[PDB]
Design a protein around this ligand. Structure first.
Ligand SMILES: [Zn+2]
Lengths: 710, 166
């Protein structure tokens, strides 16, 4: 009957999403509460929920899966809320101060135009590693590996003993120019490792050269500190899940979504590569969906249990920043350009004791939804509690009614905490929280677009929080988007983007090819020979890892690329090779010509400085094998009047100081072409789509809805 | 716009960063001055009205009875009439030797006192340091600020000027 082949996953603060793709592209989606202390438990439960719609067992499916992609949010959250581990740092003696000085930069990282110049706005955050947990070793290696000041190994032994004594929970080692010559930094690491053995303590050590061998020491050290600070807690998670699944009969190695939009292996020790894996899942699904349906300019908007994630897909592509910042930290890993604000369905609603103003978040309730769920033990109300008071949520359909949500719990806790301290009704208490959030999310989405120089009418807005379809009206109202779309699978949209991700392996090797403009055709063939070699050395790496994953070389599609620049420069360009093979003089002329071409486009024709000569800085090799991508429905459209079968009664719905009996519709029972006039709520097992009075929706043949102002 | 207790925290150097950014990045609250000056008033131990703050512990003030405008310390000392330089009626310490400069600077980081002098200016009653100048030798005392108090209250604030004698 059915062969299930691809699985995507968003392990979130609230729900763990599963997205199953079968051989013909047909899919089904599962939801379960996360089990953040061991995400395997929720993964299994969600799998069994999704698979049960196909009347199929978790056992039977796992034997057929050919690949799966994991994405999540546990690590990213730990960084943002500075809830990492008491981590310590060893750097070169005399330069212990550089972490906490933040290279000056980090007193204005990610500032809008206006605050970049408003001087009194600049502010330093706490350093990831405080000064009393930094130490210094006496060593110095220069920009080409020469050891000017040899490592005085004694200072490394005291460095270790100091941080062991300080009860550090991990130790990071960053020595200048170690990417070039890691001898001294790896001796330090070994010496530290020795001292932790003697202490009996459980302290892991991170050499920056072992993780992020790249220039710019503030970037490298921040990124490496991330492995100690935030990655380590969720290090258990990918081996707990992978073990639980091979135990259960999977024959593949999981992949993870990584910061540049591509997948990497679950085995990699650089978990910081996988830190924005969940959000990037959503951006990739929206990218995929656009390609099928020709939407080239899409603004992505995701609302989860904890935050509101937002990115722009500009002419078919996402933007990837090279040496980016994130959470006001310089980092060495390539990142997809996104943005968020820390509010979601579970964000906690508190009143300033002195101002008596409402502050949403920044923390969330997570898989515990709020007070409305009796067994959650949550005492502070959450935005989800206002949903219940106002009639947004159905008390008896959280997770299909598998979860008991009591409205009167929400009403009593809203009154005591918010309504009565503010002299308002529970209706007006709840409606003012939702109204503030509506405007706060709306002004952010409008401004990230304004900032990048675009009008909202140049884009189509994909909305897919899983709790975002509850406020699509809110943050979109009057922005002037060309169209606003709620796809029917909105709740597992990132896990949708993960099952949609290309099966691709990438491999890199750096190089030192230096050519003047005027060169004889023998220096020119020598250069083409050495690049030609590196592609072959890389080509066997791509194919060798695809063999260990059960793929013969015939199924692998190969794409060579290289990195070039004018001779004296600091940054280079990736260039897709027009030739798969190089070799002969004129081909090296093609590779330079191609470079020149893109440099004109990337910058300006008159930026070109051929007279400086050329420098080839690396070589690249990509490897694609085919995979069932999720098939977007193409249903025949019918009448605008929806069937009587889809009516499920009404709920008391309160918006602008008014109560109305809002119709209830079963999402799956709606047909292509129907229309729904507000006030109405559209419900399925795990998505609630809110259309207040004053709005309208219609459904198309691709199970996409469309919000109109009306 | 801003809560009163939040403008207090701002005076006490204890305001939270969110509201500090809010105050900076958005249009100013027309009401600030009247809330501010009232916040300072209730923290003085003398009931004479404050007209304009000159420093953290220094004010232009309206004598409750005579209605004269004067410069006043927080402690009580009236220096002079408000149109005069208060520093002319204050006490001054001049750092003009390496020994005195090296009391507030490590050597080498101190200025050289044949080029630059530190002139500290104190209230006579409480020893409070209201202002420190850093000019050259010979350089006059500096009359920092001569405010157009009438126009401020009358044209920019929409307030009556406080009663005034000479
Ligand atoms: Zn005094």
């Amino acid at each position: 009957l059915r062969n299930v082949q691809v699985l995507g996953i968003d392990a979130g603060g609230t729900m763990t999403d599963t997205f199953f793709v079968d051989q013909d592209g047909d899919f089904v989606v599962g939801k379960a509460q996360s089990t953040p202390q061991n995400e395997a438990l929720g993964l299994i439960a969600s799998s069994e929920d999704g698979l049960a719609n196909w009347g199929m067992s978790l056992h039977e499916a796992l034997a057929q899966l050919q690949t799966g992609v994991y994405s999540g949010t546990a690590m990213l959250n730990r960084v943002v809320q500075r809830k990492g581990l008491k981590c310590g740092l060893i750097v070169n003696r005399g330069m212990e101060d550089f972490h906490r000085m933040g290279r000056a930069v980090q007193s204005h990282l990610g500032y809008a135009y206006e605050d970049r110049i408003h001087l009194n706005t600049h502010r330093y955050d706490p350093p990831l590693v405080p000064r009393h947990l930094t130490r210094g070793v006496v060593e110095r290696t220069d920009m080409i590996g020469t050891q000017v000041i040899p490592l005085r190994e004694d200072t490394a032994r005291d460095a270790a003993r100091d941080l062991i004594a300080a009860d550090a929970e991990g130790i990071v080692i960053s020595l200048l120019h170690s990417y070039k010559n890691p001898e001294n930094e790896r001796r330090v690491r070994d010496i530290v490792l020795e001292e932790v053995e003697k202490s009996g303590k459980k302290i892991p050590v991170f050499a920056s050269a072992d993780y992020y061998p790249v220039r710019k020491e503030t970037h490298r050290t921040n990124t490496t500190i991330l492995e100690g600070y935030a990655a380590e807690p969720s290090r258990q998670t990918l081996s707990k899940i992978s073990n639980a699944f091979k135990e259960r009969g999977t024959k593949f190695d999981f992949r993870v979504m990584a910061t540049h939009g591509g997948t990497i292996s679950w085995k990699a020790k650089e978990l910081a590569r996988t830190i924005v894996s969940g959000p990037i899942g959503g951006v990739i699904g929206a990218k995929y969906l656009g390609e099928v349906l020709g939407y080239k300019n899409i603004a992505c908007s995701d609302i989860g249990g904890t935050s509101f994630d937002v990115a722009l897909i500009t002419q078919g592509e996402m933007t990837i920043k090279n040496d980016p910042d994130m959470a006001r930290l310089v980092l060495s890993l390539p990142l997809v350009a996104m943005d968020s604000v820390g509010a979601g369905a579970g964000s906690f609603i508190r009143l300033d004791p002195y101002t008596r103003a409402i502050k949403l978040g920044p923390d969330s309730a997570g898989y515990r939804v709020g007070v409305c769920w009796k067994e959650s033990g949550i005492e502070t109300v959450t935005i989800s509690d206002c949903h219940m008071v106002l009639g947004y949520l159905n008390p008896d359909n959280f997770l299909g009614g598998a979860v008991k949500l009591d409205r009167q719990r929400s009403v009593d806790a809203i009154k005591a905490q918010i309504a009565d301290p503010l002299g308002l009704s529970v209706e007006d208490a709840a409606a003012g929280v939702i109204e503030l959030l509506d405007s706060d999310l709306r002004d952010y989405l409008r401004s990230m677009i304004s900032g990048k120089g675009y009008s909202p009418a140049s884009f189509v807005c994909f909305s897919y929080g899983g709790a975002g379809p509850v406020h699509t009206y809110g943050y979109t109202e009057g922005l002037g988007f060309e169209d606003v779309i709620v796809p029917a699978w909105a709740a597992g949209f990132s896990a949708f983007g993960c099952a949609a991700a290309d099966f691709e392996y990438r491999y890199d090797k750096s190089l030192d090819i230096n050519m003047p403009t005027e060169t004889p055709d023998t220096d020119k063939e020598k250069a083409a020979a050495t690049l030609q070699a590196a592609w072959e050395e890389l080509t066997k790496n791509v194919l060798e890892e695809f063999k260990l994953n059960g793929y013969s070389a015939d199924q692998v599609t190969l794409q060579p690329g290289y990195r070039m620049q004018y001779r004296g420069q600091l940054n280079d360009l990736e260039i897709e090779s027009p030739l798969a093979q190089a070799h002969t003089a004129a081909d090296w002329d093609q590779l330079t010509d191609a470079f020149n071409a893109t440099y004109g486009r990337v910058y300006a024709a008159s930026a070109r400085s051929p007279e400086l000569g050329y420098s080839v800085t690396g070589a690249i090799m990509r490897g694609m094998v085919p995979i069932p991508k999720p098939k977007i429905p193409k249903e025949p459209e019918e009448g605008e009047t929806p069937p009587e079968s889809a009516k499920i009664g009404t709920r008391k719905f309160y918006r602008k100081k008014r109560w109305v009996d809002a119709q209830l519709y079963h999402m799956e029972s709606l047909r292509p072409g129907n229309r729904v006039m507000g006030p109405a709520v559209i419900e399925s097992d795990a998505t609630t789509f809110v259309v207040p009075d004053g709005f309208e929706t219609w459904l198309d043949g691709h199970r996409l809805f469309h919000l109109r102002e009306v | 716009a801003y809560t009163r207790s939040k403008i207090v925290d701002l005076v006490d150097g204890k305001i939270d960063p969110d509201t500090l950014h809010q105050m900076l990045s958005t249009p100013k609250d027309p009401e600030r001055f009247v809330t501010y000056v009232e916040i300072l008033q209730e923290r003085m131990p003398w009931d004479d009205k404050i007209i304009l703050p000159l420093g953290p512990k220094l004010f232009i003030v309206q004598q409750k009875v005579s209605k004269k405008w004067t410069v006043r310390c927080e402690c009580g000392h009236d220096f002079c009439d408000w149109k005069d330089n208060w520093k002319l009626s204050a006490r001054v310490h001049v750092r003009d030797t390496p020994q005195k400069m090296e009391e507030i600077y490590p050597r080498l980081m101190a200025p050289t006192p044949s080029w630059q002098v530190i002139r500290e200016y104190f209230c006579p009653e409480c020893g409070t340091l209201h202002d420190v100048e850093a000019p050259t030798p010979w350089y006059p005392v500096i009359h920092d600020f001569s405010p157009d108090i009438e126009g401020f209250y009358q044209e920019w604030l929409g307030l009556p000027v406080p009663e005034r004698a000479d």
